[PDB]
Symmetry: C3
Subunit: 138 residues, 3 copies
């Protein structure tokens, strides 16, 4: 039962907005999380929103260069699976993919103990009407 | 896995004593509980006894008006399912039921964190030889 | 889900070395353990080694008379099942068995709470080529 933080993956054409979640899986009474999400040059941050687990948490973020620093604190504890936050991006046969990387993680439970976490990075690709991808979501 | 506190339900004729438990379900290292159990005018409190989980806890109760204030502290932690205490009451086609209500709950785990709990109230009815109810207990 | 500490059992002829683990089962974020393992006169301690769970714990032991005092501290917490340490012994139809006893246990989780544990002692016998026992290990 290992706590894992996961950046979502996505694909979209130039000019469109995408919503990419960062999720947690198997959280066990997490009380604070600080992390950095790095994103590719092809993306531009439009907004950062609380997720399904953090609607009532103390939530901060700061966008600097190609990274979003996010801070979450929640005296109730966060447990189980769900989104920590969503990033709204705008997208500015071969092809190449880009990483949505999670790093600089600092995570503690509500009793102040360090929590071991695994991380999984996201992948983003610029794509055409290949939004059969939306059609195939599952 | 949500911690729930549940007042038992019962039925009996005038003049008889009944034993109504207040139980906990899915407790996770609970260290202290304060609560109020309100009871109907048709009932009169004869005794308040420790339950299956609190035989060795620090246990206090105070009966004032139509409510029983109960305090439990236990440095070992209380976990799982079982009774917190039992109330011995004396009972003083249509018909009407009465609530055994749980409120004013204050509950913390052994590390001093607030515990989220759900509550379920009990129901009491004055009844005749409908103690096929005892016969059907299951 | 009760935390249990278990001394392993073994059999071997005079003159041979044996490796006996002391294991934990269903540990839940244990932060410190002190215990005493007592052993029979027919055994002599050659070494005491960290186990599968304590390779990176702070680990101390002291052999005095027929008992090994072991101290383990680990800020990460120890959870699940595995060995806490291994003792390398040298063995110095009827027959008689000997106890490898666990006692004097003091165990706390990473938040400093006392942990309830059960213990299971080990059994050692001097044996011949009955090391079909190794052949039958399972
Ligand atoms: Cl921040
Ligand atoms: Cl950390
Ligand atoms: Cl009280
Ligand atoms: Cl509370
Ligand atoms: Cl020692
Ligand atoms: Cl102890
Ligand atoms: Mg604590």
């Amino acid at each position: 039962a290992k706590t894992t933080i996961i950046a979502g993956s996505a694909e979209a054409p130039q000019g469109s907005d995408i919503q990419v979640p960062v999720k947690i899986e198997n959280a066990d009474k997490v009380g604070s999380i600080n992390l950095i999400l790095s994103y590719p040059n092809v993306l531009e941050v439009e907004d950062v929103l609380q997720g399904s687990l953090t609607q009532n948490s103390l939530f901060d973020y700061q966008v600097e260069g190609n990274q979003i620093k996010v801070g979450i604190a929640d005296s109730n504890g966060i447990s189980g699976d769900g989104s920590l936050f969503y990033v709204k991006f705008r997208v500015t046969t071969l092809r190449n993919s880009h990483a949505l990387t999670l790093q600089g993680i600092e995570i503690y439970d509500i009793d102040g103990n360090s929590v071991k976490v695994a991380t999984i990075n996201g992948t983003f690709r610029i794509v055409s009407q290949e939004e059969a991808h939306h059609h195939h979501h599952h």
